[PDB]
Symmetry: D2
Subunit: 143 residues, 4 copies
């Protein structure tokens, strides 16, 4: 299948325990290419807009409060079947249900503080990436 893109956010729990290099290597080892990256401190509004999807959900407030508790790292990953592949090595959203070797298994403390977020689909990825990055900022690799 064709090369796709997905968004990776390293959440503040993983940033603050200094496991950024560790997490990014996992993606690279799986054959994904990091084609954009920037560390940013999300404002309240910025977080609300990204998770606008879940605005009417129950725990939107806690999610937002956690995602703005410190700096995150926002990333675009490129490669063959990138969406499903990112998802695989990240593992189940719930860390206690995650497989051995996944990022959720190895770095996540709880449901809330689950280390990293990833795009769940083809369509979700396009929106999530466009939200954080202008198209010119994405530097797909040439050599």
């Amino acid at each position: 299948m064709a090369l796709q893109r997905t968004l990776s956010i390293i959440k503040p729990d993983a940033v603050s325990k200094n496991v950024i290099g560790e997490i990014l290597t996992r993606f690279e080892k799986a054959g994904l290419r990091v084609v954009a990256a920037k560390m940013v401190q999300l404002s309240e509004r910025e977080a609300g807009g990204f998770y606008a999807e879940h605005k009417e959900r129950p725990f939107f407030k806690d999610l937002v409060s956690f995602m703005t508790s410190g700096p995150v790292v926002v990333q675009v990953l490129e490669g063959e079947d990138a969406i499903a592949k990112n998802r695989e090595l990240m593992g189940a959203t719930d860390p206690k249900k995650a497989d051995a070797g996944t990022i959720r298994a190895d770095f996540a403390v709880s449901i809330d503080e689950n280390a990293v977020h990833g795009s769940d689909s083809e369509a979700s990825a396009a929106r999530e990436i466009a939200y954080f990055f202008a198209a010119t900022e994405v530097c797909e690799r040439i050599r």
Copy 2:
């Protein structure tokens, strides 16, 4: 003695061979904290301005050529005695003369393609960091 900052650039050789995660983890393992990060592709001018110090030096233009051949990753590392510490684990500029365990030993192919650059002092760090980052972009860790 105090916490300092230094600039790390992962050069295009290391970006294109997908060793970014690997290199960042080395920094983190040594107890440095990544407090800013962004992937950019340097334009001709960007590069010239950063290495303005060596403009007068003869090869300069091969360095410029190399640094703009593809995307790089620019980061700010924070921690105790951060300058000397970054330099330690980076290793000698010349990769053949670097020790075992350093980034130059493990990732660098030649003098020219030597994987990464780092600030070489207290004062050069301030200038190099200010060149790539506004002070508000630097996100000191609170959690």
Copy 3:
């Protein structure tokens, strides 16, 4: 009917002759709102990844050459029927065929150096804006 958005680029001819304030006020007087703005020096690469649409056109080379000859200003304009309105006060692409009172009439020297560019439809606007700006950077205002 509905409030829309369009992209404004003040090209390097107009930037270098210091007419930025003049042009922006024209937009504002017409009831459009500037909801994003940044001055950038477009790289040779950036070059019309923007103008990818005219990549096969003959004189593409000169357009790109001109658009990177100096700094431009990239803007998002918001308001009722913003697309047609921007186009109205901008005027015809040829400055000599442009109507009196328009930007092309008042600031443009030639076909090549025609002061400013604008989005030509709803669909082209969405693409052009997304190219230069992440959605979070666009600040619709309240107060």
Copy 4:
């Protein structure tokens, strides 16, 4: 003495009443050059850091409230004795006391909502500019 730089912030009062074009043209007419610009929505944290100088002053709280109430425009102006020239055009901080023709006279409603901020010295300018802009983002004019 040579060309200098100063920071201009168009505050949210002036942004929301759509006088950005008007204010910028004033600067340009005076022979100052806009060499950087970006519209931003300052978070609490961003604003507090910029006015860190007045953090022990009593009124601080209201200043911060106002500066984050909506989007602002941050600008770097370059030209001969740019610092005193920016200050001339702007007028007295207190709009009552401002001369005719100045920005404070023509756009400012009160002490709090005084339309725009500027750097007050060489030294304050260097820090204010560095705070919002990396040195590479500043595009001094060619051509």
